[PDB]
């Protein structure tokens, strides 16, 4: 019955717990703790290269990010196993955040870079390794393009981490290419 494995589950719990903390303590106090290192003295607090992905300030984005995390991460954990999901997450979180802060500074967050990685990965891995048993549905490709496009053209009304999203997608494509040389 259950569709979400342990990694899928624990990521959702963490995102929720952090979302609550941001209501109780305020956005900024949590950002100070969880943001990408915003000072050289913070560059060895290694959690911060990944924890930015757990922060949301917007009810709509956390909902949608967790929706696609639940669905795509769940598919990947079930078919390809927990370890694979962990690696895509850490690598996409790391590199998406790297590209984002490079061009716009450290004040950012959201699980969306990991979601785009997962979209990229499930798509390409399905396209050219059909026997893997993972596949990105056409309806989902459409839904993800509109969402991306809405972000690029600022239709949501908020500030958008376009670097992290595009970098995240690229990572998920690259990993799927490699993973399916076969």
């Amino acid at each position: 019955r259950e569709r979400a494995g342990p990694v899928t589950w624990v990521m959702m719990i963490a995102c929720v717990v952090v979302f609550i903390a941001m209501q109780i303590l305020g956005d900024q106090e949590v950002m100070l703790w969880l943001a990408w290192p915003f000072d050289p003295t913070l560059k060895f607090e290694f959690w911060r290269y990944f924890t930015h992905a757990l922060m949301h300030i917007s009810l709509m984005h956390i909902l949608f990010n967790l929706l696609w995390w639940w669905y795509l991460g769940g598919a990947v954990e079930k078919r390809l196993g927990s370890g694979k999901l962990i690696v895509i997450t850490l690598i996409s979180a790391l590199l998406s955040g790297y590209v984002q802060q490079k061009f716009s500074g450290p004040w950012f967050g959201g699980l969306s870079g990991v979601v785009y990685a997962l979209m990229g990965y499930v798509w390409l891995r399905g396209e050219r390794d059909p026997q893997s048993g993972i596949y990105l549905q056409r309806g989902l490709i459409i839904f993800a393009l509109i969402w991306i496009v809405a972000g690029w053209f600022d239709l949501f009304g908020m500030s958008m981490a376009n670097g992290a999203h595009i970098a995240g997608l690229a990572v998920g494509l690259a990993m799927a290419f490699v993973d399916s040389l076969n």
Binding site: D27, S58, G113
Partner: peptide, 4 residues
């Protein structure tokens, strides 16, 4: 926050 830029949201991702």
């Amino acid at each position: 926050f830029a949201t991702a």
